[PDB]
């Protein structure tokens, strides 16, 4: 008995909250799906990917781009792409500081590089440019800094003591770079960042230095967090107990099949557990913090741009990316790195439109809104307006289809009107109000009755599942998604389509 959008004047109050949900920045970002990483300083210009060797050389020496760094062309090529957001690195590893900082000497200023107007901060370059096209910023900066004096625990003369003893405190250094690039207008899209990434990546023979993650993390949010005026606290990688966008665990743009926002937090020990299986975190349905998957990967074999690294991945490397990824309720935060000339190598540019315009023509046309096609539902909640089962194909996030109170399950029939081809099936919960599906299955038929063939069974959907199969014809889709006793499934979005040929699999 399938239930449609027609003559539903129940009424009922909404299916309560999960205690754990996104904040505002969390969700907007697992709706965006798409990042870009920017890899950019010496390394681009000496053929390394851990600038470990430096040395004593001068900033002219290993930073010696001649031409104006192409912000525009990047930020343009990626908007165009569908990504919505750009994480630049302002310092790796290495220590060079790709703005004009008044912290250290190691940085662009010192370098000799100057733009058209003798200006010497890329970064300053790339926020203009990410500000003019509306374009989100993250600020990576490498906590392990292998230049910075500071780093470790150094009598005044630079010899080995320990910390009560130490004469110059990196945290205060890292702090005061924190403070300069968050504090500035002209850093970010229009003075803003919405994500800081600080991996503990670290050479093992490094030294020791202990961070003082509560300084930092009240730096950013009083720069860019609530504390500074915005709807949520800025996102942080790489900060332990204190993680809102965790590593997805593998750099192959690859999450585990049923992938949850969730992790373990332990803010007294400064401790998380996102539940390691495999190769990726999965996190944990009685996760206890909102911690969005992000899932970063190479666009060629290394994340800096040389002259043996300048190959992108084909259409089927990304494509399964994309699957794996933004299918399996994580973000694909892709890295595009520019050359030693301040541009990007056309090949790369256009891999990237070619991606773009592919995820742009699979999901041009949902095949369960197309003329004689219907969505209905096994039961509405309260036979009310509000969550009748037209509200899944609505391109609108906050109108989603649920069941009344004591139903914890529902099936979703999509009647496409004709035998179709298709190999993609899209399913979007409404995590606004918490991730809480644990059991999901797809099926098909020909025709309107007979035995289901099933497509696809799993655990979680989350801002996204893609289901994704071989060319397959069929009439009718049913969907079915439940959750655990005493609470309700939430579908914002459902859709069919077929893929094009480079995203087929
Ligand atoms: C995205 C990756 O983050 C890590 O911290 C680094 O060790 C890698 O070089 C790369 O920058
Ligand atoms: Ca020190
Ligand atoms: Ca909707
Ligand atoms: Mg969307
Ligand atoms: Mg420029
Ligand atoms: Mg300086
Ligand atoms: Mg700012």
Redesign the pocket.
Known sequence: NWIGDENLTGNAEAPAKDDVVPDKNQFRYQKEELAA?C?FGPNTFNEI??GEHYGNQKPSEIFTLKNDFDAETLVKTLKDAGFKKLIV?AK??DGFCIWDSEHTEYDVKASGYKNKNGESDILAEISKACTDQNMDMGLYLSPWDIHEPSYGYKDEHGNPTTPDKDAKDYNEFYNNQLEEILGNPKYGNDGHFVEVWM?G?KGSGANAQEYDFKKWFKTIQDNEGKAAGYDADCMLFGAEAYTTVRWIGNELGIAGKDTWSKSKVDKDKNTINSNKQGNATVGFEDGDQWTVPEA?ARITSG?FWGTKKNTPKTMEELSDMYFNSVGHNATLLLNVPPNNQGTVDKAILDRVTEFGNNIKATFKTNLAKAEGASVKVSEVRGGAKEYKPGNMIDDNDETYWATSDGKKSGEILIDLGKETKFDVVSIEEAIQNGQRINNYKVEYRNGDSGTWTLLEEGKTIGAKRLCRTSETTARQIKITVGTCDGKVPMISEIGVYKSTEDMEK
């Open positions: 990483f890899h990917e851990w690195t790796h590893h991996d990546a970063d994340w």
